[PDB]
Design a protein around this nucleic acid. Structure first.
Ligand SMILES: [Mg+2]
Ligand SMILES: [Mg+2]
Ligand SMILES: [Mg+2]
Ligand SMILES: [Mg+2]
Ligand SMILES: [Mg+2]
Ligand SMILES: [Mg+2]
Ligand SMILES: [Mg+2]
Ligand SMILES: [Mg+2]
Ligand SMILES: [Mg+2]
Ligand SMILES: [Zn+2]
Lengths: 68, 103, 204
RNA sequence: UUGACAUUGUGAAGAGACAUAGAGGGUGUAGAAUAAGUGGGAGCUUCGGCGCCAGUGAAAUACCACUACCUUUAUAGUUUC
RNA sequence: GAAGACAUUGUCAGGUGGGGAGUUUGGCUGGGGCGGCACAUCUGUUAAACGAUAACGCAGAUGUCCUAAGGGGGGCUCAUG
RNA sequence: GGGCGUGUGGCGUAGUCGGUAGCGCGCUCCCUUAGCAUGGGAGAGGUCUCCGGUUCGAUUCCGGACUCGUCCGCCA
């Protein structure tokens, strides 16, 4: 899904062009988030690539290749 | 005002080039199309966050609009336009005035 | 093309149980609104005869009255003061001449039942007096139409086969293209059955 | 908060709607009948019954060639609960 | 044990939403406000016999109306006594 | 701007294409009662908002204008 803007109670304190909270989109891919979290888990390794394996309504599933 | 349904006037249709008979109707504006460039640009500007992005007129002052006669040449179907002065009431049906009659 | 010669090639000769006059109508739908502008119209051109029992009451009483009696079938004069009130009932077409232009005295009381009043649909003051007699006597619907549709005319007598219906059809069913809009279907004449009183039923 | 789509797989009935065939019916007026149309004219017809020229009724009345409108109903096709 | 392809969750779409955000809320003017418009204009006067000329000066008017109340021609003469 | 409706006597209204149209209050005038009130009747009262068309014939059906009322819509 989208990236809900992490502001308290939806208040942004500025112009109406920046009042958006809900329909905002993260500029990186869910696959990129997956690789970042896996690399943080195994910081001794190096991320080579990744690929989609499955999805449902809540989760997307990736397999990450790493090299020691 | 009362304007007749026919009028003999000049026709610049490249085959008439003279006074011919014309049918007179009232001009109506016509439906504002999508895919006109201004409408496309306006919809693009309106989409997303930021609210209303163009002015919306409020301080109306006229009580009339100018009437445009659209004239159809009966020979070559060439159309002409002419605008009249401001009038509160307009009629094309010709009920001519009569002078020496009762009220 | 509706049919070249198919399904109506000989199904009018082999069915002779009644040799008497066989007139079959052609009824089909095209629905329209309540207006009265572009309905029953379309006087066509057609070569088949009618051999009907109608009356042509032409009003022209110069000494070519017998020329009118051999080119037509009734001569009338303008003594219209108590002539007709309830006589004219059997008619397929009428015709008049130069002297029927100011007949509004006799026009209102009796030209109301069949409604053959001299309106823009009924142009009897005709100057051409030799051309609309032997060929236009054949049936053609030039009347006032109802709230929905009036489309019925006989295309052929049962004694006449399709040797002229191969040619009157495609000059005939192009009916309302010249005045009406295309709310109607393209050549909306479709499923028809030829039966005056004794024909069989055929479907497209 | 409401709807749609996705998450989302497996079965039953019932009720509609649209098409598809059939079915009968209809106010004043009066001629010859509770008259809702349509072009043609007298006959196909067990009857001389119904209509023709006959009257009158806004309209001619056997006959439908199309059903103008229905649901009161029957079957299988699509679709919506 | 319950519940079940409905909830839930995701994305779009319509409603509601001073709970919250951002902003705005004319001018002239014997201070400002209330009033008025002297804010775009027209006639007469103030206006000092070319032109120009102020005041919330004076007396008034405009946002319309007319297929004739426009154009051409002919005939005729009005208020009043 | 679009869509959906309304317009009837001095007033409030109902209405089948066979209606200048039925009602209820206002006015009069009779009747009933010994009489007054209450009651019951009859008579005047609507060019059906206006203009055209359709229909054999429209308050009624259709088209246009005026007024009013809902909902939706909004870059000169
Ligand atoms: Mg997220
Ligand atoms: Mg900020
Ligand atoms: Mg976009
Ligand atoms: Mg948006
Ligand atoms: Mg605020
Ligand atoms: Mg100020
Ligand atoms: Mg001067
Ligand atoms: Mg003048
Ligand atoms: Mg003069
Ligand atoms: Zn021209």
């Amino acid at each position: 899904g989208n990236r809900k803007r992490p502001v308290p109670k939806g208040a942004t304190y500025g112009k109406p062009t920046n009042q958006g909270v809900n329909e905002l989109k993260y500029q990186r891919s869910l696959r990129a988030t997956a690789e970042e979290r896996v690399g943080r888990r195994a910081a001794n390794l190096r991320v080579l690539n990744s690929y989609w394996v499955n999805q449902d309504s809540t989760y997307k599933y990736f397999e990450v290749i790493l090299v020691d | 005002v009362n304007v007749p349904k026919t009028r003999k006037t000049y026709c610049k249709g490249k085959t008439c080039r003279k006074h011919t008979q014309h049918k007179v109707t009232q001009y109506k504006a016509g439906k504002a199309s999508l895919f006109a460039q201004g409408k496309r640009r306006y919809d693009r500007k309106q989409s997303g966050f930021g609210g209303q992005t163009k002015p919306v007129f409020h301080k109306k002052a006229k009580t009339t609009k100018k009437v445009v006669l659209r004239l159809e040449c009966v020979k070559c179907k060439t159309r002409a336009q002419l605008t009249l002065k401001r009038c509160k009431h307009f009629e094309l049906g010709g009920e001519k005035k009569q002078k020496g009659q009762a009220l | 093309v509706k049919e070249l010669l198919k399904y109506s090639n000989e199904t009018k000769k082999r069915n002779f149980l009644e040799t008497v006059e066989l007139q079959v109508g052609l009824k089909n739908y095209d629905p329209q609104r309540d207006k009265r502008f572009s309905g029953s119209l379309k006087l066509p051109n057609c070569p088949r005869p009618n051999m009907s029992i109608c009356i042509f009451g032409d009003a022209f009483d110069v000494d070519r009255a017998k020329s009118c009696g051999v080119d037509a079938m009734s001569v009338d004069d303008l003594k219209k003061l108590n002539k007709n009130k309830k006589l004219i009932k059997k008619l397929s077409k009428k015709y008049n001449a130069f002297i029927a232009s100011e007949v509004l005295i006799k026009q209102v009381p009796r030209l109301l039942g069949p409604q053959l009043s001299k309106a823009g649909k009924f142009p009897t003051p005709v100057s051409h007096n030799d051309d609309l007699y032997g060929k236009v006597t054949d049936v053609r619907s030039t009347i006032k139409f109802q709230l929905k549709k009036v489309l019925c005319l006989a295309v052929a007598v049962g004694n006449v086969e399709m040797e002229e219906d191969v040619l009157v059809n495609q000059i005939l069913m192009s009916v309302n293209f010249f005045v009406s809009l295309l709310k109607k279907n393209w050549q909306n004449v479709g499923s028809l059955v030829v039966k005056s009183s004794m024909g069989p039923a055929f479907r497209l």
